[PDB]
Structures are given as structure tokens and as C-alpha cells.
Design an enzyme around this catalytic site. Structure first.
Site, PDB file in Angstrom:
ATOM      1  N   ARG A  96      14.488 -15.082  14.089  1.00 46.45           N
ATOM      2  CA  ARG A  96      13.916 -13.875  13.449  1.00 46.45           C
ATOM      3  C   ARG A  96      13.658 -12.649  14.336  1.00 46.45           C
ATOM      4  O   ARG A  96      13.472 -11.544  13.830  1.00 46.45           O
ATOM      5  CB  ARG A  96      12.646 -14.214  12.653  1.00 46.45           C
ATOM      6  CG  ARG A  96      12.902 -14.686  11.241  1.00 46.45           C
ATOM      7  CD  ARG A  96      11.593 -14.999  10.561  1.00 46.45           C
ATOM      8  NE  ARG A  96      11.522 -14.598   9.151  1.00 46.45           N
ATOM      9  CZ  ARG A  96      11.767 -13.374   8.695  1.00 46.45           C
ATOM     10  NH1 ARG A  96      12.153 -12.411   9.515  1.00 46.45           N
ATOM     11  NH2 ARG A  96      11.650 -13.121   7.411  1.00 46.45           N
ATOM     12  N   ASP A  97      13.624 -12.832  15.648  1.00 49.62           N
ATOM     13  CA  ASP A  97      13.430 -11.707  16.569  1.00 49.62           C
ATOM     14  C   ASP A  97      14.431 -11.733  17.715  1.00 49.62           C
ATOM     15  O   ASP A  97      14.062 -11.569  18.884  1.00 49.62           O
ATOM     16  CB  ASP A  97      12.015 -11.700  17.131  1.00 49.62           C
ATOM     17  CG  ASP A  97      11.503 -10.301  17.393  1.00 49.62           C
ATOM     18  OD1 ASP A  97      12.315  -9.342  17.393  1.00 49.62           O
ATOM     19  OD2 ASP A  97      10.278 -10.162  17.584  1.00 49.62           O
TER      20      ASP A  97
END
Ligand code: K51
Length: 340
Positions: A176-177
Site C-alpha cells: 500500500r505504500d
């Protein structure tokens, strides 16, 4: 769903260490790990650089009693407002950190705690992150503005693709990052994916959206959809990282105002010129079709059409990847760090 105390979470970790802070002379220690400096103040997070037995370590500090005070509205399912603290998020991160063990991901060597303060021991990746950001991206410094050689970028991409394979397929975890700050290099020079603070377990290969860094978020977050394919998300973001690796700049997402950014992503075609186009501009080599051929496969707006990690890995572009290119890159880059 709902998660227990920190103790329940660490209750199955086999290398939990009791906190011992002490001072010996002109030095502060955490369990034989000597505090050299704090590498960044993420206001919260916080990574401390330490020495122990002629090895450099990176220990991430975490404070329950500070983290449980920082609380935001999450907005519920039932019209009755819910509220998550940044300590709730940490409990999730703990679980994941607690089970990431892989040679392409930054893996904790042990966890130090009294169940309030947590110091998570990692190796210190001596060549730092892939790129750093200040007004724009750079490798080493910013009066000297070099681009990563294309031969090196291939490996980097292949390596994080191997990270992806493990988290998605072995672990059912979406990062997600994915971001240049999060892709780390050692002096040798291996590449590991790091920082699982926004990562989460997938449900039927999907995540509930809006989380991570704004300009690395995929077009689907801006759609009708309530859920997104975790892998395709991570793929997009690695796409942005590649775009950043090409040009030392983010695609259409050039900050200032986000409406500008958020209106772009889902609608905008990206510009694909040669290396320094975006860059002679704030300063008072070449790219081939094939390089861009490959980047486009990452940054396709419909995620179902977006490349899988399998078909990426065995694409003709990474076919001639040579680990030695990265090793030599890394060895000289480290030589420049040995004093700048
Ligand atoms: C912001 C920087 C202080 C940070 C992240 O880009 N840079 C570095 C540089 C070297 C290094 N070696 C290990 C680590 C490191 C360790 C743990 C995490 C986490 N979570 C994230 C990074 N890191 N992090």
C-alpha cells in the site's frame, strides 16, 4: 477484525526482548545497541541508528502512550461514529512486522519492549533509499544531478517484484505504500522493500481503499469502486517508482494543490519524453521505446489490464538483467557516502 493488547500480538514472537535502557559514559544504549543518531523524525515513527558489535542497526521507536492519544474519525458502518487511534494502526503493523520474513523485504531481527515503548531492530541498509526527495528526487546530492543507469533500474525493479511475489502470494499482504523512500539498498547491494505501516491483509485479494501516499495511489481509488485488487495497487505504485527512477520526478502528480493531482490521475495521459525533460527546468541520459514500452504496462488505468507481477518478471525488458550492474553501482555509490 478487532485486535487484542500488544502482548497478545507479540505473544507468538520468539525473539521478544525486555527493554533495558542504560547509559555508559558519553553514550546512550538500548540493550547493547548504542544510539548514534535518529535518522528521521517522522514526528511519530522515528528510526534510530545504532551500533552493536561493529554492525550498524536501525531501530524504529514506537510509543503506545503517545500513539493512543493521536486519534481520528474513521466513520463507521452503522451511522454511530467510530474512531481509530494511531495505536490501533500500530497493532496491525505489529502483526505484519511480526510475520514478514523474506530476503527481499526488510525483516525485523528482534523486538524490544516493555509493552509501552517498542524498539524494532532491523539491519541498517547502508546505501539508504533508492532516491531521496527534496523539491525533487536525487540519488546522492542535488548540485550533482545524476540518473540511475537503466541497467541498475532493471535489477531494482526485479528485486521489488520478488518482494511482491512473497507478500502477495506467500503472505496475502498488500504493501500500500510502495515508494522510493521504501526501497532500500545495502552496500553490497541488495534491495529490500521496507515500512509496512500502511500494509494490510487482503480479503479475496482485495483491500478497502484510500490509504498510503497520495501521488502513488492508483486511479481506481477515484472511482465508483469500494474494493481494489491489492497486487494491482502495489504494481501501480512500483510503476510510479519506475517513472520516478526514469525522470527523478513524479508523473502527473506534481503536488501544490491535490485537486489538480486527483483530477489528473484518473483522466490524464502521462508524458514519456527523455530523462531530463522535466529537469533542465529547475536548474537555470536517453530513453528508448522499450524502456517506456515497459513502464506503460505498469501505469495502465484499468487495473485488470495492468500488468501482473508474474508477466512483469518474465518480460523481455528484465530478461537481460544482470545483478552485477547493481553490485558495481552500489559499490561506487557507497564509496561516495564514505564521505559527503
Ligand atoms: C526516512 C529515512 C530515515 C529512512 C526511510 O527512507 N531511510 C533509511 C535508511 C537506511 C535504513 N536501514 C534500515 C532502514 C529502515 C528500517 C525500518 C523501517 C521501517 N519500518 C524503515 C527503514 N532504513 N531507512
Amino acid at each position: 477484525g478487532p485486535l487484542g493488547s500488544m502482548k497478545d500480538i507479540l505473544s507468538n514472537y520468539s525473539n521478544l526482548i525486555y527493554l533495558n535502557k542504560y547509559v555508559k559514559e558519553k553514550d546512550k544504549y538500548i540493550n547493547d545497541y548504542r544510539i548514534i543518531r535518529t535518522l528521521n523524525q517522522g514526528k511519530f515513527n522515528k528510526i534510530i541508528l545504532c551500533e552493536k558489535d561493529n554492525k550498524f542497526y536501525a531501530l524504529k521507536k514506537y510509543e503506545k502512550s503517545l500513539l493512543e492519544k493521536k486519534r481520528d474519525f474513521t466513520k463507521s458502518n452503522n451511522d454511530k461514529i467510530s474512531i481509530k487511534s494511531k495505536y490501533d494502526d500500530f497493532k496491525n503493523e505489529l502483526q505484519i512486522i511480526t510475520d514478514i520474513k523474506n530476503e527481499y523485504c526488510l525483516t525485523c531481527e528482534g523486538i524490544i519492549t516493555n509493552y509501552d515503548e517498542v524498539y524494532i531492530i532491523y539491519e541498517y541498509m547502508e546505501n539508504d533509499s533508492i532516491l531521496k526527495f527534496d523539491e525533487y528526487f536525487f540519488v546522492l546530492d542535488k548540485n550533482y544531478t545524476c540518473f540511475i543507469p537503466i541497467q541498475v533500474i532493471k535489477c531494482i525493479i526485479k528485486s521489488v517484484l520478488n518482494s511482491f511475489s512473497y507478500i502477495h502470494n506467500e503472505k496475502n499482504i498488500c504493501h500500500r505504500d510502495v515508494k522510493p523512500s521504501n526501497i532500500l539498498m545495502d552496500k553490497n547491494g541488495r534491495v529490500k522493500l521496507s515500512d509496512f505501516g500502511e500494509s494490510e491483509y487482503m480479503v479475496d485479494k482485495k483491500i478497502k481503499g484510500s490509504r498510503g501516499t497520495y501521488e502513488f495511489m492508483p486511479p481506481e481509488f477515484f472511482s465508483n469502486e469500494s474494493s481494489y485488487n491489492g497486487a494491482k495497487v502495489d504494481i501501480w505504485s512500483l510503476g510510479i517508482c519506475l517513472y520516478v527512477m526514469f525522470y527523478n520526478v513524479v508523473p502527473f502528480s506534481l503536488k501544490i494543490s491535490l485537486v489538480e493531482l486527483f483530477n489528473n490521475i484518473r483522466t490524464k495521459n502521462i508524458e514519456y519524453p527523455l530523462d531530463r525533460n522535466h529537469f533542465l527546468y529547475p536548474l537555470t541520459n536517453f530513453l528508448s521505446n522499450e524502456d517506456i514500452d515497459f513502464l506503460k504496462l505498469f501505469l495502465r488505468k484499468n487495473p485488470a489490464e495492468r500488468i501482473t507481477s508474474e508477466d512483469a518478471l518474465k518480460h523481455e525488458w528484465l530478461a537481460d538483467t544482470n545483478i552485477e550492474d547493481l553490485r558495481e553501482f552500489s559499490k561506487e555509490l557507497y564509496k561516495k557516502r564514505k564521505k559527503l
